[PDB]
Design a protein around this ligand. Structure first.
Ligand SMILES: [Ca+2]
Ligand SMILES: [Ca+2]
Ligand SMILES: [Ca+2]
Ligand SMILES: [Ca+2]
Ligand code: NA
Length: 585
């Protein structure tokens, strides 16, 4: 039975104006092409003089020249060798060739999270062998990341963890070992060597991309030796008992390189394992107190807990902070488990590290707090103005959209819309904790993900993060790249909320820069399912201007009146319910 197996370009694609042919691949060998037309859908005129040629089960169509920003349909009726008839079509959009010219200092910022939990494991290692060596890959890919519009990359923890080569990076063992020393059965980390990493950073800086380090400062794991430790009278478990604590770290493999600091019992407030009784608990060490944290009793999380009241410990870790930026040339950090670490210490280190260099070091904390007020109150407590946080509040809205949400409420959702806190939001859709095959605390954004990316990447505030697993593993690249184009060239100037949002449609306006031609955009997203085209009358702030949907979804243009208003459209479906209207000229 006759069907189209695939086409190049694929239906829905955005293509180069230099596309020279369309290949259609069919199920059976093809006897005939009865009708073929390539149509410009804006003017509704067929391109005269196209040619085709039959090769077994393939049909190559050529002899055309496509205009930028134009939507085309290739319609065909073929008869196969068993006299089956198949009628069908493919559609595609041509990329803009002449983009708006944005002054380099105003270009929008955009982060790629360069990892996922199961990288280089199970089928992932099979289907994606290039990820057995992440530093080398990021090196290879720097120029295409930059072409995509990424301005920074957040790396997985680059230091040696307690599971060695299988450590995703959070079983922190040695901060000063970046896959330079044979420790935990491996010289390299799961991701590569120190040299490879230094390679990648040059690769990336070479293409004008920053590199953030994922600093896990709360705990330590895989200690070199155990120690007998008495537990405080205030310990929740086994108070005033003696336990055998895995608390000795001296990093034999590194042998003092970079830092000769070593760790024991007095470097930690406590632990969760007693190797005498072979029991888990929460164990507070004699004369230690849990450090000051936003919420009561949340210093203790897992592993051996760092005592950031200890001055020697504060000093070694401030020194590493500094080494990472000034010596290893990173441009910033993600701060794992930021609310489980002494707030006074986080402010002190953020200040020491910021103060040690002329570069403006970027900092973002992982504080999994879905209420905005609670999260602002955490920012207030830490009280260091450089401290950004991930907008888990906003993501809670994208979880709400999984089975339908009240879409007008996106006007006020997340840290990213809280007055006085909007620029401290690092917005995202999924990450390694929220999108993981097994053992997640949440549900991934498994539906309406494109809508959620469009919202964050068009916004005037915050800094958006794309997830590697979305972009490269679930293969959302094709659709994401169109949103990344929007952000890179169009999402500029003041942002405006509109007055006609409802249960199912949210629209938003970026007016463009006055002193830049052809930038600006109208976003419309929907959680509707009716399967059809809805309009909203929106003031684009650009009088007498022809716009088109750069997503390829709506195959018409919209021209605004002399007040700048126009009827902009979106398709109310899960699959295609996002549109981004940009100027054609
Ligand atoms: Ca802690
Ligand atoms: Ca303490
Ligand atoms: Ca809705
Ligand atoms: Ca403009
Ligand atoms: Na502590």
């Amino acid at each position: 039975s006759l069907f189209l197996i695939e086409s190049e370009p694929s239906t829905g694609a955005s293509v180069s104006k230099n596309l020279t042919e369309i290949i259609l691949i069919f199920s059976n060998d093809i006897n005939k092409v009865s009708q073929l037309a390539l149509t410009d859908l804006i003017t509704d005129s067929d391109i005269q003089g196209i040619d085709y040629n039959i090769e077994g089960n393939k049909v190559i169509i050529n002899n055309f020249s496509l205009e930028p920003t134009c939507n085309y349909r290739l319609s065909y009726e073929v008869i196969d060798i068993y006299d089956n008839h198949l009628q069908g079509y493919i559609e595609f959009l041509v990329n803009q060739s002449n983009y708006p010219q944005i002054p380099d200092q105003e270009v929008n910022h955009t982060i790629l999270q360069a990892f996922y939990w199961e990288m280089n494991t199970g089928e992932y290692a099979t289907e994606h062998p290039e990820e057995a060596n992440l530093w080398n890959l990021l090196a290879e890919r720097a120029p295409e990341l930059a072409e995509a519009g990424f301005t920074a990359v957040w790396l997985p923890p680059a230091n040696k963890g307690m599971a060695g080569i299988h450590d995703v990076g959070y079983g922190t063992y040695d901060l000063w070992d970046l896959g330079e020393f044979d420790q935990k059965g491996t010289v390299r980390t799961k991701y590569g060597t120190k040299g490879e990493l230094e390679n990648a950073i040059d690769a990336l800086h070479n293409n004008d991309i920053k590199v953030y380090f994922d600093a896990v400062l709360n705990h330590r794991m895989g200690a070199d030796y155990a120690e007998t430790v008495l537990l405080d009278e205030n310990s929740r478990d086994k108070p005033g008992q003696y336990i055998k604590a895995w608390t000795g770290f001296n990093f034999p493999g590194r042998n003092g390189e970079y830092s000769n600091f070593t760790w024991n019992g007095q470097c930690f407030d406590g632990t969760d394992w007693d190797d005498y009784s072979k029991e888990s608990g929460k164990y507070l060490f004699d004369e230690k107190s849990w450090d000051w944290t936003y919420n009561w009793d949340e210093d203790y999380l897992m592993g051996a807990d760092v005592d950031y009241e200890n001055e020697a410990v504060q000093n070694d870790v401030i020194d590493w902070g500094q080494w990472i930026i000034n010596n290893i040339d990173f441009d910033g950090f993600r701060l794992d488990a930021v609310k489980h670490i002494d707030y006074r210490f986080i402010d002190k280190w953020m200040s020491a590290v910021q103060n040690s260099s002329n570069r403006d070091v970027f900092f973002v904390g992982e504080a999994w707090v879905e209420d905005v007020d609670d999260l602002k109150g955490f920012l207030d407590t830490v009280g260091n103005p450089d401290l950004r946080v991930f907008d888990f509040p906003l993501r809670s809205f994208f979880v709400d959209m999984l089975n339908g949400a009240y879409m007008a409420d996106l006007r006020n959702a997340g840290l990213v819309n809280s007055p006085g806190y909007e620029n401290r939001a690092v917005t995202f859709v999924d990450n390694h904790d929220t999108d993981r095959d097994e053992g997640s605390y949440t549900v991934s954004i498994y539906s309406r993900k494109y809508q959620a990316y469009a919202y964050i990447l068009t916004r005037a505030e915050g800094v958006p993060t794309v997830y590697w697993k979305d972009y490269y593993i679930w293969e959302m690249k094709e659709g994401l790249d169109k949103l990344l184009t929007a952000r890179r060239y169009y999402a500029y100037g003041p942002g405006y909320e509109v007055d006609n949002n409802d249960a199912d449609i949210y629209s938003y306006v970026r007016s463009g820069f006055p002193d830049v031609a052809g930038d600006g955009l109208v976003l419309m997203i929907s959680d509707g399912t009716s399967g059809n085209v809805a309009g909203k009358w929106i003031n684009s702030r650009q009088p007498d201007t022809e716009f088109y949907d750069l997503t390829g979804h709506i195959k018409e243009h919209v021209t605004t009146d002399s007040e700048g208003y126009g009827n902009f459209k979106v398709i109310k479906s899960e699959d295609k319910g996002w549109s981004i209207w940009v100027p054609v000229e």
